[PDB]
Write a structure and sequence with these properties.
binds chloride ion, Lipocalin, binds 2,3-dihydroxy-benzoic acid, 1 helix, mainly beta, innate immunity, binds fe (iii) ion
């Protein structure tokens, strides 16, 4: 029902050159998060969660995000399939998600052992949603990388109340 900031043309979202799927694997913490249905919530700040990418034999990722919610560890699980050029992905078993007609992932940049920026886009009940995650191998990143992520999001038309920085926690996400 509610109006949405439109998705940007893909022409504005870079693709990472020579993507290495082996080195992008393992666990990443979500240290920055923006998108058109992401809202700053000062009363109740978003908490850091993690996303583990596991490379399978068939070259798909099995993908698990671990979050802390209502005193418990939640697990959100899905398969990312290699898309039309390397470092992009489509969603496996799209039909089994009600309302979902379109899903897209594009890794924007990464140095594989410190940080990454990734882009996501879905159509759900004919509404078009998008987000950008700032990832780290630890729960901390520098001012430089964070201002880099604020500039890139703003370049996609997101104002600053649609850009947030999950607070580090120890429950569920560690290992
Ligand atoms: O639906 C979720 O809980 C969720 C968790 C991690 C990452 C996502 O994109 C999600 O939609
Ligand atoms: O956010 C979602 O709706 C979603 C749907 C299907 C698969 C996913 O990984 C998601 O995050
Ligand atoms: O949560 C979201 O806003 C969202 C947006 C685009 C794609 C997703 O998977 C999401 O979870
Ligand atoms: Cl994520
Ligand atoms: Fe999602």
């Amino acid at each position: 029902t509610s109006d949405l900031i439109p998705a940007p043309p893909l022409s504005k979202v870079p693709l990472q050159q020579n993507f290495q799927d082996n080195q992008f694997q393992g666990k990443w913490y979500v240290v920055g998060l923006a998108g058109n249905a992401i809202l700053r919530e000062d009363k109740d700040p978003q908490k850091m969660y993690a996303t583990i990418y596991e490379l399978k034999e068939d070259k798909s990722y099995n993908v698990t995000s671990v979050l802390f919610r209502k005193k418990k560890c939640d697990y959100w699980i899905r398969t990312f399939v290699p898309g039309s050029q390397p470092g992009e992905f489509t969603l496996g078993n799209i039909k089994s998600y009600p309302g979902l007609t379109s899903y897209l992932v594009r890794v924007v940049s990464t140095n594989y052992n410190q940080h990454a920026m990734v882009f996501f886009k879905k159509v759900s009940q004919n509404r078009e949603y998008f987000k950008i995650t700032l990832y780290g191998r630890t729960k901390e990143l520098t001012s430089e990388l964070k201002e880099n992520f604020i500039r890139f999001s703003k370049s996609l038309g997101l104002p600053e109340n649609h850009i947030v920085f999950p607070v580090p926690i120890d429950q569920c996400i560690d290992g």
